[PDB]
Amino acid sequence: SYETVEGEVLLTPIQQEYFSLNKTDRNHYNHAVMLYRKNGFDESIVKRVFKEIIKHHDALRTVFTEEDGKIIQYNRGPDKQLFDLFVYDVSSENDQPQKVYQLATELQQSIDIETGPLVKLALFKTNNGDHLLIIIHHLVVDGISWRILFEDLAIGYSQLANGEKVEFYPKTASYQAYARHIAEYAKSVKLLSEKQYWLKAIAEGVEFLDMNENAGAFKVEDSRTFSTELEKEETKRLLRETNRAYHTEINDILITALLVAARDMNGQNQLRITLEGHGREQVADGIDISRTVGWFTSKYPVFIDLGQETDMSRTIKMVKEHLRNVPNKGIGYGILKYLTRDSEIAKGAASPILFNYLGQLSSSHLSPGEAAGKGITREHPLEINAVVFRGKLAIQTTYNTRAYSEDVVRAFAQNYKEALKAVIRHCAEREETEKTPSDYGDKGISLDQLEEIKLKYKGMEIEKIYPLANMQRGMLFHALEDKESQAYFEQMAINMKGLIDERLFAETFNDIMERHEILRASIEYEITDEPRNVIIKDRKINLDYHDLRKQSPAEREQVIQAYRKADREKGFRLNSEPLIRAALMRTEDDSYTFIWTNHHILLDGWSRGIIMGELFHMYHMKEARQKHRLEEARPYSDYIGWLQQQDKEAAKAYWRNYLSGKRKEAVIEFPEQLTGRITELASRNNVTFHTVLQCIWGMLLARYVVFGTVISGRDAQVTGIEKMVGLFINTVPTRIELIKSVQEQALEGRTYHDMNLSEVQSLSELKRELLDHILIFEAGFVFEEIYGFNIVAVPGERLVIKLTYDDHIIAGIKGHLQQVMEQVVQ
């Protein structure tokens, strides 16, 4: 999909930063590489490869022109001057390194942004090989872009030398499209939600080293660079046996050493630095730039304040956590500063130091010259670059002479090396690996809060921690609001007939626990700010097995009913105790009684049936010595993560406008023809059977309006929802060709069927008086099964409606039901 772009392109924030800092001597600031080929460079081939390279990476042709102080960036067409190629013969000089350097430096300052092409070349010829110089202005290339250029040139040169036409890989999204993409993202509400974060990162300035106030503008001519290194032994410890202490990365240790060094000399536990990101991860789902050539570097500040904490074991954790809390990898700050132009953002203090860790690591031996001008202004007095060349960490320290003296910077570099060694030895000698809140998936937990959760659940390994779903949160809030501690219990008794191996049933039961993590979850609401699901790794639940075969069935039933009464009396204390309890008692040889109790938070009735079915399937596979066949279970955390993904402020808007205004049972069976007739009416109107029956109930309510309907809550766009275990059941209110009109009412709420009823009625005038009732629509061993106003309807050949009320009025309810479901059909 090769294309070509031409015309105005918006300035990316990195480009806008370049023009703001550099107002004079902006002509030459380049990215230069020297290459050596033993057999020599064919002048015909190199000028043809670069001709195709430039028109394939359209950023290289762009031009920056000025109009009364404003900068307009234009992308030139392929027909204009693409590059300048110069060829030199330094074979006979006998002082080639001197001659090539002076030639390369002169050509490196010849770039005119307004007129000249931004790519210029210099081929040097020697009797012992040829050298090619590639100079590209930094406004159209970065570190990753040159890696792309090298691959295309290597493929292009090899294939062109073999006679074939040059054809590169298909072009990705243009830099012009990328610039317009981030500019559109500049006014998105998602980015503007990060203003308070970046305000904190720039609110205060760090004194750091003693700086000369009269340094003026920091420049390249006033900047010196020296490097310090760690020996191989200590560098080996950092790479291998350091990250294991707290599950950190190499960048965490180096940044921590920066704070430790500043802590020892400045006395403050606060440090502000600027970090460089490659800026190639898409901010919003859309344009990708995997192969696009351009300047995608994104700079953002990070301000770390540890208060009074000096225990460096704690320091490493909270420094790692602070780096884990940067939103969108820091791309937001650059967009917010230059594309949104927030005045508060533009007034932040300058970061005293710029830090960047490149990572781990034919080429020519001749220098390419100075790639930057002496008049180029640099916004950071200090720059630190850390690289491991062979096996040793080389710390390249760049400082401005006018800002800091040489001895001061070398002193800072030396004790930063000492501070780094202090951090390395602390992690190397660490015995046990300490997990961090970001490692558990929830970075909203403080270090102390995690320790209390660990302390509360001591003796148990925590697997994952994530917040409760809004369905679970509503359940817990009225669970603490004691409703006699009876509405939160789901207790059933299921007897089964057959010969059961006790260990296999327990093992099959435990395999269910591992399969569904929510059953192993314990609710935490006191330690954390919000209720949070704490999942224990090896949390088992004991299936207490008592035989009691040798007694009368009436005597057995007395013990069975006593246990059902006794365990219901116990309740759920939520004191770090499992919320699932099951008992297996053996009435006789092939007749058991299995009772199951659970808290409403963990699962619903739909999930309850799934567990029983999976338990039935897996156990029989155990008997046959054949592995079970079953779909992979999707974690309940994925649904919660999706739930937190989409915003529900519009969901609140949806419901607020919608709302503007002794146990007895009875069974009603209708003729099969009557049930069949209304089903035909639903099909002809393209209206669901749920919708048509809602209208028939709604019209009656007008004579006595909005009523409550129970929904599975399993329509979310998460894979495997229908077969995953969790709390998805919900009751939602519905307000009432009429069947067609409310048919689209159901689909409008389909997107917003995820919030609890208690918060929906808060948007209503009647509040708790909104709903008076609910409407419900429905060799081994074998199974067998044994509000105060709810209505249940069961479809089938004959319509059956079961109504429970906690007397002749009931007859009147039935009589009017059948009389009104007759006139409309005819």
Numbering used by the authors: 4618 to 4978, 4988 to 5287, 5307 to 5349, 5355 to 5386, 5396 to 5437, 5454 to 5461, 5469 to 5488, 5494 to 5513
Please, what does the article write about this entry?
Nonribosomal peptide synthetases (NRPSs) are multi‐domain enzymes that catalyze the biosynthesis of therapeutically relevant natural products. For unknown reasons, COM domains co‐occur with epimerization (E) domains, are partially embedded within the adjacent condensation (C) domains and can also be found as internal cis‐COM domains.
In the E‐COM‐C structure, the cis‐COM domain appears as a small globular domain sandwiched between and partially overlapping with the E and C domains. Together, seam, lid and helix represent what was initially defined as the COMD domain in trans‐COM domains, and all these segments make extensive contacts with the E domain, including salt bridges between E5060 and K4934/R5056 as well as between D5065 and K4937 and an interaction between D5074 and R4931. In the E‐COM‐C structure, the E and C domains are oriented such that the PCP binding sites on both domains face each other (donor position on the C domain).
